Amino acid sequence: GAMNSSNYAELFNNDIKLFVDDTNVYRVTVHKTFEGNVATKAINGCIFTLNPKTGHLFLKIIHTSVWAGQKRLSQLAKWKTAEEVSALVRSLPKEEQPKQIIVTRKAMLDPLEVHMLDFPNIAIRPTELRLPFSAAMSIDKLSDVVMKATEPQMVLFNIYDDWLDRISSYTAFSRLTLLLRALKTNEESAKMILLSDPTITIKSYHLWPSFTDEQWITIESQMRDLILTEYGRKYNV
């Protein structure tokens, strides 16, 4: 059924699974019209489809042209997400297709379930975790590829860089979610922390800086402080 803190290690077993997060599929700026009314302008978005074991991220870019002349866009966005996830599964070889797909938001369940009817053995699941995948657009290189897109496009990343060479997938996923939680609660401070030392660079083929093991501990520590800090600055504690 639903995925939560009790069955958290199942993410890192050998049954292929994907997380799907649709938060950033339909993105708008809200503005005033000459007549003093409000209007939205859509900007490019993405589906965040992530294998939590391997780090493989299938970033389907959603070009604003997909909304042209469509109504009830927030509702369409969920079905478009489902259409694209289903098209992704069908494009994968059978032995790479997921056994489960976990949606981060419950409103995706019925749209994905209907689009995956042809895949009765793929279990579509919600989660009670509050995962920070909405902050994926705070990762500069992912934001850059979405905004520059001039057509629908799928880009493949490994969101863990080379981390799996040194750490387990459980640890890699805990780092990832800590970074993204920080970027979601205070993006500026989070990005300040990640780059404050000019000597640590981001490899052209990576997303995040090339920290040593020790430097990663210091980083992770500073990100938890930030999250606790903001939790105070928010609630005054």
Place this chain on the structure above:
Amino acid sequence: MNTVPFTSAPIEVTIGIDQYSFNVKENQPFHGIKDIPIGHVHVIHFQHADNSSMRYGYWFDCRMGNFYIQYDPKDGLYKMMEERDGAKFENIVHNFKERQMMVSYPKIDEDDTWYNLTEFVQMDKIRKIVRKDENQFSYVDSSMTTVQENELSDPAHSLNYTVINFKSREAIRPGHEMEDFLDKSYYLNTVMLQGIFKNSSNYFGELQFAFLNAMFFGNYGSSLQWHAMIELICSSATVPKHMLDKLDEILYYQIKTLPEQYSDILLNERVWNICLYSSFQKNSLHNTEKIMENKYPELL
């Protein structure tokens, strides 16, 4: 006017006939029910005084044969049977009528309730879901499960209602996922009406039958089938105008007839609130909405 003769009444039982019911005491001199309106199906049902568990009964149509009730002390129930010897039967009935041992089906002349609840309910069709072909009448009880229930265990004793499932390949055209899931007109009009039921009368008949089994036997899977069939129409943007007018009448009389104290179980809050207030046909069920608001405003 036709007659259903009871060999005897050896156990205390509440007897239903259509929407009417009467108590019979252990070994009371009861020998059946007379003056049954020809032209309609009928149901005659039973609830033993000792074990209110298992309401059971028999759908029948007096035009199709001479039918009688006799208690079976081995299986412990009142069984319907057919008498093929017409004169043996006329003579049995005439004697019990002369001795005034029968209750009269008590139809008020003004009263169209039973007609209105069974308008699309034929009896040869009833037997296509309650499969027992050696009999002209059909047994139903509280605990029989439907074909669809068994998919999610004895097949001979099942209710073979039409399977409706909104998240099935049958209901959803490839490439029309969103369209077909949010407006079910394709599934209603093409798959079910044109494909399976053939016409609105076969749709209405199954639906009316589902309701009556839910009300009379507390058959849960019937209740599920009745809600599903309502939800498929209400969730279709394109329904023939005659079907909506007729549906409004059908549901009106079903809601009118439901015992006031059984609404809590027999009525699905989500389905009704969706059908009356959110669905495409939210404005097309005036009579049904008005009786539901005046009779069961709590559900809503």
